[PDB]
Design a protein around this motif. Structure first.
Motif, PDB file in Angstrom:
ATOM      1  N   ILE B  63      15.934 -30.984  59.527  1.00 42.25           N
ATOM      2  CA  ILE B  63      16.494 -30.572  58.687  1.00 42.25           C
ATOM      3  C   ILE B  63      15.776 -29.150  59.440  1.00 42.25           C
ATOM      4  CG2 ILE B  63      17.139 -28.809  57.086  1.00 42.25           C
ATOM      5  CD1 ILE B  63      18.822 -31.204  57.644  1.00 42.25           C
ATOM      6  N   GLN B  64      14.633 -29.515  59.312  1.00 41.09           N
ATOM      7  CA  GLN B  64      13.679 -27.817  59.472  1.00 41.09           C
ATOM      8  C   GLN B  64      13.891 -27.319  61.458  1.00 41.09           C
ATOM      9  OE1 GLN B  64       8.914 -27.368  59.381  1.00 41.09           O
ATOM     10  NE2 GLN B  64      10.130 -25.946  57.916  1.00 41.09           N
ATOM     11  N   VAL B  80      13.572 -20.985  57.323  1.00 41.12           N
ATOM     12  CA  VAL B  80      12.787 -22.208  56.828  1.00 41.12           C
ATOM     13  C   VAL B  80      11.767 -21.921  56.192  1.00 41.12           C
ATOM     14  CG1 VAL B  80      10.602 -22.608  57.500  1.00 41.12           C
ATOM     15  CG2 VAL B  80      12.350 -22.897  59.295  1.00 41.12           C
ATOM     16  N   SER B  81      11.278 -20.590  55.447  1.00 40.79           N
ATOM     17  CA  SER B  81      10.744 -20.187  54.283  1.00 40.79           C
ATOM     18  C   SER B  81      11.686 -20.476  53.340  1.00 40.79           C
ATOM     19  CB  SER B  81      10.365 -18.989  54.197  1.00 40.79           C
ATOM     20  OG  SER B  81      10.135 -18.237  53.323  1.00 40.79           O
ATOM     21  N   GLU B  82      12.337 -20.166  52.674  1.00 45.51           N
ATOM     22  CA  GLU B  82      13.548 -20.986  52.201  1.00 45.51           C
ATOM     23  C   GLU B  82      13.747 -21.998  51.338  1.00 45.51           C
ATOM     24  OE1 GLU B  82      14.179 -18.956  49.462  1.00 45.51           O
ATOM     25  OE2 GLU B  82      13.242 -17.259  50.055  1.00 45.51           O
ATOM     26  N   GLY B  83      14.144 -23.182  52.901  1.00 49.88           N
ATOM     27  CA  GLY B  83      13.919 -24.750  52.484  1.00 49.88           C
ATOM     28  C   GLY B  83      12.862 -24.645  52.632  1.00 49.88           C
ATOM     29  N   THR B  84      11.586 -24.459  52.718  1.00 51.27           N
ATOM     30  CA  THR B  84      10.181 -25.087  52.157  1.00 51.27           C
ATOM     31  C   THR B  84       9.731 -24.547  51.125  1.00 51.27           C
ATOM     32  OG1 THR B  84       8.918 -24.865  53.922  1.00 51.27           O
ATOM     33  CG2 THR B  84       7.595 -25.355  52.922  1.00 51.27           C
TER      34      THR B  84
ATOM     35  N   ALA C   7      14.991 -27.367  42.007  1.00 54.89           N
ATOM     36  CA  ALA C   7      14.221 -26.551  43.101  1.00 54.89           C
ATOM     37  C   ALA C   7      14.707 -25.317  43.525  1.00 54.89           C
ATOM     38  CB  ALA C   7      15.871 -27.011  44.198  1.00 54.89           C
ATOM     39  N   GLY C   8      15.070 -24.394  42.875  1.00 54.78           N
ATOM     40  CA  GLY C   8      15.378 -23.801  42.020  1.00 54.78           C
ATOM     41  C   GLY C   8      16.745 -22.382  42.799  1.00 54.78           C
ATOM     42  N   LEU C   9      17.368 -23.392  42.987  1.00 53.39           N
ATOM     43  CA  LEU C   9      18.715 -22.916  43.657  1.00 53.39           C
ATOM     44  C   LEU C   9      20.235 -23.503  43.220  1.00 53.39           C
ATOM     45  CD1 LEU C   9      17.912 -25.445  46.635  1.00 53.39           C
ATOM     46  CD2 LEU C   9      17.982 -23.462  46.732  1.00 53.39           C
ATOM     47  N   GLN C  10      21.383 -22.627  42.980  1.00 52.24           N
ATOM     48  CA  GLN C  10      22.463 -21.859  42.611  1.00 52.24           C
ATOM     49  C   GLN C  10      23.479 -23.225  43.841  1.00 52.24           C
ATOM     50  OE1 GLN C  10      23.602 -19.295  40.570  1.00 52.24           O
ATOM     51  NE2 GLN C  10      20.634 -19.995  40.875  1.00 52.24           N
ATOM     52  N   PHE C  11      22.870 -23.168  44.622  1.00 53.06           N
ATOM     53  CA  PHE C  11      23.768 -24.220  45.914  1.00 53.06           C
ATOM     54  C   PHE C  11      23.520 -25.997  45.404  1.00 53.06           C
ATOM     55  CE2 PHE C  11      26.448 -22.886  49.170  1.00 53.06           C
ATOM     56  CZ  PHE C  11      26.794 -21.576  48.601  1.00 53.06           C
ATOM     57  N   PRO C  12      24.205 -26.465  44.848  1.00 49.99           N
ATOM     58  CA  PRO C  12      24.793 -28.407  44.795  1.00 49.99           C
ATOM     59  C   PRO C  12      23.934 -29.063  45.594  1.00 49.99           C
ATOM     60  CG  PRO C  12      26.879 -27.658  45.974  1.00 49.99           C
ATOM     61  CD  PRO C  12      25.738 -26.209  45.860  1.00 49.99           C
ATOM     62  N   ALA C  38      20.262 -27.558  51.407  1.00 51.14           N
ATOM     63  CA  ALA C  38      20.998 -26.059  50.490  1.00 51.14           C
ATOM     64  C   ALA C  38      20.830 -25.152  50.114  1.00 51.14           C
ATOM     65  CB  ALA C  38      21.156 -27.244  48.772  1.00 51.14           C
ATOM     66  N   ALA C  39      19.450 -25.180  50.535  1.00 51.77           N
ATOM     67  CA  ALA C  39      17.898 -24.208  50.507  1.00 51.77           C
ATOM     68  C   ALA C  39      18.696 -23.233  51.099  1.00 51.77           C
ATOM     69  CB  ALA C  39      17.098 -23.683  50.132  1.00 51.77           C
ATOM     70  N   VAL C  40      18.723 -23.646  52.641  1.00 48.84           N
ATOM     71  CA  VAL C  40      19.125 -23.011  53.980  1.00 48.84           C
ATOM     72  C   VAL C  40      20.523 -22.606  53.761  1.00 48.84           C
ATOM     73  CG1 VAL C  40      19.941 -23.018  56.478  1.00 48.84           C
ATOM     74  CG2 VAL C  40      18.308 -23.654  55.438  1.00 48.84           C
TER      75      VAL C  40
END
Ligand SMILES: [Mn+2]
Ligand SMILES: [Mn+2]
Ligand SMILES: [Mn+2]
Ligand SMILES: [Mn+2]
Ligand SMILES: [Mn+2]
Ligand SMILES: [Mn+2]
Ligand SMILES: [Mn+2]
Ligand SMILES: [Mn+2]
Ligand SMILES: [Mn+2]
Ligand SMILES: [Mn+2]
Ligand SMILES: [Mn+2]
Lengths: 86, 94, 105, 98, 79, 100, 107, 94
Positions: B63-64, B80-84, C7-12, C38-40
């Motif tokens: 994904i990264q 990438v920073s949010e994903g990590t 995860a600290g997310l709003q997206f599912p 989801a975070a991306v």
DNA sequence: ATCAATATCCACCTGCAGATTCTACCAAAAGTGTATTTGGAAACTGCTCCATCAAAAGGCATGTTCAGCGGAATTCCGCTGAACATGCCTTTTGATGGAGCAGTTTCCAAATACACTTTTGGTAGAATCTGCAGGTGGATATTGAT
DNA sequence: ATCAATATCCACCTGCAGATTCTACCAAAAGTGTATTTGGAAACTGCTCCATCAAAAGGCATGTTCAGCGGAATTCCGCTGAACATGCCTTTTGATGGAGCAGTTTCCAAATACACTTTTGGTAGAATCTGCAGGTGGATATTGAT
């Protein structure tokens, strides 16, 4: 050890080489400022492709850029290349 | 007749960024197309990555690298920073 | 309690997981993949909502409409490139007149 | 002391290069350019020699097609000489530029 | 006729939105020809998706999938 | 009491300014709806269309013609004209790779 | 026991095509007629390019088809040119083509 | 370290249309890329087609619509005939 | 520079199409523990192929001179398009029944897939075969001066 | 048009690098038999798609006039093509050290499908909620004549 330093290699793309490419492209007369302009468009083009090829290389945890890395990079940019395993 | 969409989450995010801004139904529909479009581009690149490297698993790594291949400079850097951060914040849980 | 919250997310996270498993992307889906994805998606959504929000406020409106999404995306170098081949319905275009067309002052 | 008129040798050149398929940029200088750009993204990379050739075949094909479009832009403006503004119009219309 | 139904004024508005200031008279028929080619290409694919799903109704999704594969992705109608 | 008239190009500039501000469709709907069914009929007879399908077709066709007109304008200006001509559209399409 | 290719009347490998469709994660399942139909299409497109490339080789007095003959075949054929419109054939060069206004003056 | 290639089949088809013509290794590499490229394009359009219609199977029908969406007018017509012919012939045996 | 015809802008007003919140349904999902499997990471390691450089050899880049002719400024003026006003044809919106045809559920038969396990169609390496690159030379063709 | 400097075509000539042919292993195709499903066919319902009258009037089409755009002709400064002389650096071929890469083997963390349980997400009668599209007044700006 100690590979020499690489700099200013874009000037290795000579004015003669650039007229040839233009001839193959059907160009008959070329203004003096075309050469630096072409050199700048080529660098941007290589940077974009090499960047993606190296990203495929790193993801595979290798240190050698393969023809497949270049072929996949050209493909993802919509410049599909045939002839190198791709 | 149930039809899933990202509408309620896009709305939750809109509230965290602009507490007093709302959104039209057409704009929501556009935002839903956006999330679907990026999901497909990223998952598709991730699939190719795994296939190119002969693995049968799509992990946060694919994904990264996908995000890196698809998003322009700064956007890539932040995603990438949010994903990590999200993966860390998720492994650091009970 | 909820994968998204851990995860600290709003997206599912769960829905994304299911979309990834059922999309024929690969035989197996890693546990972190849907988290990262989801975070991306949440981040990109916020980035666009943040600028569309500002566009709304500039035109003195409180409700984000397609026009604000278009203004947000075309005025931002990077979102414009990412959405370089996308058409936002009812988005219109950026006001822009070639200088050679302006009357002589 | 014989002299071809301006344009005469350029046309023979167009005929000769449109007939062959050989790479037109020297090989070593192109290879150094590739290494230099790559080295600036990541140090310590090696290259299969066929990776460099693939980059060179893609690069030359791209520039040849760009000159074809650039030439059409010059001709549209009633010129037979390409100029930087022709290349820029072509890249802009192609979506390679904002 | 139908393509002819796309009027000179409508063609002129589209051009204004495109930042165009002066239009030659031969532009209207040229545009009409370009619009028809564009529509044929997209409608052909949308109808092909319609037939494949064994339907008799062209859906928005059919058009959306057709625009997408022609590299003309459109947001706002689903998918 | 009154005669008055704006110079050529002045109203053209207000129209650009006004259409670049709005987002509404600019081709009349029914005439467009007919064009669409007519074309679809050559591929498969007796088809029906969801109303949102005709709309998607219109938004896409209009966004396409508008971007084409912007590229066409750059081609006219490149040649030192402020008037677009068929040859400008043809050059724009050729470079875009839509073939001439 | 006949191969599936033979049974289909094809030179292209139905079995290998079936397997590539399976390992591609294109769908959960692959019907038995899919690889047959796909193998025939691939074989048809390749016969089409080879016929035209082979003619290009004979036109240049050659016995061996090289990349240039494939490029001449694809670029001179309207439909293949379109199918391969975003494809680059290494060592293919381009079609001879000089704009009219560039030619020496008169007529 | 082995690696499949469509080379022997490309060669059979060549012998059928031009009995006395050979082919260089670089041309063959081009031909192999072409076959691989068209295979992915058609398989991907077929994959998409199945998902849009919520079917979990790719049959000859998806290949056919895919070929129809991918090839230009005349090449599509001939490919569909050859494909349909092969399926019907394959179905008539065993 | 001075009017005056029109365009554009700001403040305010308000009904209502469409948005946000209430809410109860309820099939659908997301998710937790378990027993089965396996995808793929170190550690070892054969050994491919990549980096580097040197000699020799000449192809081809560099830098200069000379002048042909391309590009572009100026001027001019024919006539194409822009502006505008008249006349009315045709789109648009909404109230309105007739019907096509989507899409859900249930029953069920043809048609997958995975593990078995038998047989052979490819592939890599060795042996065997030959098209054509590149040099020679010479007859015909194209240019460009007079 | 006549003649000279040059390039272009092309047909024969020939060593050889590269292609087409022969060989013994092994992934990987191809029959069976369950065990399991997908998705088609049909009866069926109701969402919206089509065709349409009917006001209201918003645009399209036509026509007249003329402002000013685009392009032809002429001119000439200086840029860029052609050609020459000099010699640098690319190319080809080896020659070597070894960085890396990929192919078995061993094995633990991590993923899947099933099965079961609790709730979030979708929907919609509900309606109260409410942003802002449009419309008006009146002030100032823009434009273009004189
Ligand atoms: Mn550097
Ligand atoms: Mn000139
Ligand atoms: Mn009936
Ligand atoms: Mn055998
Ligand atoms: Mn030769
Ligand atoms: Mn079922
Ligand atoms: Mn002018
Ligand atoms: Mn020198
Ligand atoms: Mn809830
Ligand atoms: Mn208002
Ligand atoms: Mn007023």
């Amino acid at each position: 050890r100690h590979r020499k330093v690489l700099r200013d290699n874009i000037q290795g793309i000579t004015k003669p080489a650039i007229r040839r490419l233009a001839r193959r492209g059907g160009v008959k007369r070329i203004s003096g400022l075309i050469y630096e302009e072409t050199r700048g468009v080529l660098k941007v083009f290589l940077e974009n492709v090499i960047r993606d090829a190296v990203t495929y290389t790193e993801h595979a945890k290798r240190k050698t850029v393969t023809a497949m890395d270049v072929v996949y990079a050209l493909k993802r940019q919509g410049r599909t290349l045939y002839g190198f395993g791709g | 007749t149930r039809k899933e969409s990202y509408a309620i989450y896009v709305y939750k995010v809109l509230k965290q960024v602009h507490p007093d801004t709302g959104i039209s139904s057409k704009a929501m529909s556009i935002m839903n197309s956006f999330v679907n479009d990026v999901f497909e581009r990223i998952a598709g690149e991730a699939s190719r990555l795994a296939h190119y490297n002969k693995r049968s698993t799509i992990t946060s790594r694919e994904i990264q690298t996908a995000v890196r291949l698809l998003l322009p400079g700064e956007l890539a850097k932040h995603a990438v920073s949010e994903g990590t951060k999200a993966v860390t914040k998720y492994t650091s849980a009970k | 309690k909820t994968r998204s919250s851990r995860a600290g997310l709003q997206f599912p996270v769960g829905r994304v997981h299911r979309l990834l498993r059922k999309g024929n992307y690969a035989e197996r889906v890693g546990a972190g993949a849907p988290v990262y994805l989801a975070a991306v998606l949440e981040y990109l959504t916020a980035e666009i909502l943040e600028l569309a929000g500002n566009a709304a406020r500039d035109n003195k409106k409180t409700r984000i409409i397609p026009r604000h999404l278009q203004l947000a995306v075309r005025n931002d170098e990077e979102l414009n490139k990412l959405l370089g081949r996308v058409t936002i319905a009812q988005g219109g275009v950026l006001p822009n007149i070639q200088s050679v067309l302006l009357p002589k002052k | 002391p014989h002299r071809y008129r301006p344009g005469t040798v350029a046309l023979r050149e167009i005929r000769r290069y449109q007939k062959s398929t050989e790479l037109l940029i020297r090989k070593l200088p192109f290879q150094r350019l590739v290494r230099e750009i790559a080295q600036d993204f990541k140090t310590d990379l090696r290259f299969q020699s066929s990776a460099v050739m693939a980059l060179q075949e893609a690069s030359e094909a791209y520039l040849v097609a760009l000159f074809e479009d650039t030439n059409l832009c010059a001709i549209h403006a009633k010129r037979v000489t390409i100029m930087p503004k022709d290349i820029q119009l072509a890249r802009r219309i192609r979506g390679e530029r904002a």
